[PDB]
Design a protein around this ligand. Structure first.
Ligand SMILES: OC[C@H]1O[C@@H](O[C@H]2[C@H](O)[C@@H](O)[C@H](O)O[C@@H]2CO)[C@H](O)[C@@H](O)[C@H]1O
Length: 239
């Protein structure tokens, strides 16, 4: 069980962020990118892939740019049929501008951007959703547990993360417009000796960089739905 647990002073303090929690909230509200059995259709930079995924409700986007940590990840998934799932942003998002020569590009009307959140479709399917347990702790006490479901054998940490936080925003007011009732918090995934966590709170300051925050998912970290367990540790802001 190692990826050093955070030392209490290591975590971002929500009281140190003085600039609109709504921008964090939106990433984990009901909207998100999801598609099954799609194939990249273009590329803007050598470390990304462009997908033809239409916003199936709000009609907010027609193309989604998936950015990876490096060229390898983009190469691996180029041309392959994948499922996509993840938190997207719009504000600092941009790519291609047109189907121009020299500058390899394409994409017309309504774009969105995201990091990682990709898995091979083929051979990664289960008929019969697997249920992953989430145990949340508030100041040290296991106050509740809820389930998250995925029908993927291999699932990105991004998806389990979004799933978990989406429930907490709805039932625990994890993030609110201008604040959060929690001072610190982190999501811990556990497979085996392998455990890793993400800080759920925004960095100190007056502004939150959605793009920079969502960047932690660019490694396309995957996990096996059969071996994972998730624990959330929240601490209450000095009442
Ligand atoms: O069993 C062969 C049969 O599968 C259908 O697909 C179904 C599948 O039967 C069911 O278990 C699953 O839950 O939903 C699928 C619907 O896509 C196919 O429609 C049929 O063409 C055969 O392929």
């Amino acid at each position: 069980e190692s990826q050093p647990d955070p030392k209490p002073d290591e975590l971002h303090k929500s009281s140190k962020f003085t600039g609109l929690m709504e921008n964090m909230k939106v990433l984990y509200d009901d909207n998100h990118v999801s598609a099954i059995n799609v194939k990249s259709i273009d590329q803007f930079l050598y470390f990304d892939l462009i997908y033809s995924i239409k916003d199936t409700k709000l009609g907010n986007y027609d193309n989604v740019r998936v950015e990876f940590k490096n060229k390898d990840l983009a190469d691996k998934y180029k041309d392959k049929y994948v499922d996509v799932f993840g938190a997207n942003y719009y504000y600092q998002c941009y790519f291609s501008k047109k189907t121009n020569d020299i500058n390899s590009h394409q994409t017309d009307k309504r774009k969105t951007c995201m990091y990682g959140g990709v898995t091979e479709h083929n051979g990664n399917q289960l008929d019969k959703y697997r249920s992953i347990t989430v145990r949340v702790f508030e100041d040290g006490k296991n106050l509740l547990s809820f389930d998250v479901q995925t029908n993927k054998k291999k699932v990105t940490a991004q998806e389990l993360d979004y799933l978990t936080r989406h429930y907490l925003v709805k039932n625990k007011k994890l993030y609110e417009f201008n604040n959060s009732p929690y001072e610190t918090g982190y999501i811990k995934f556990i497979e085996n000796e392998n455990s890793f966590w993400y800080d759920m709170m925004p960095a100190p300051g007056d502004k939150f960089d959605q793009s920079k925050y969502l960047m932690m998912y660019n490694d396309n970290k995957m996990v096996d739905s059969k071996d994972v367990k998730i624990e959330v540790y929240l601490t209450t802001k000095k009442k």
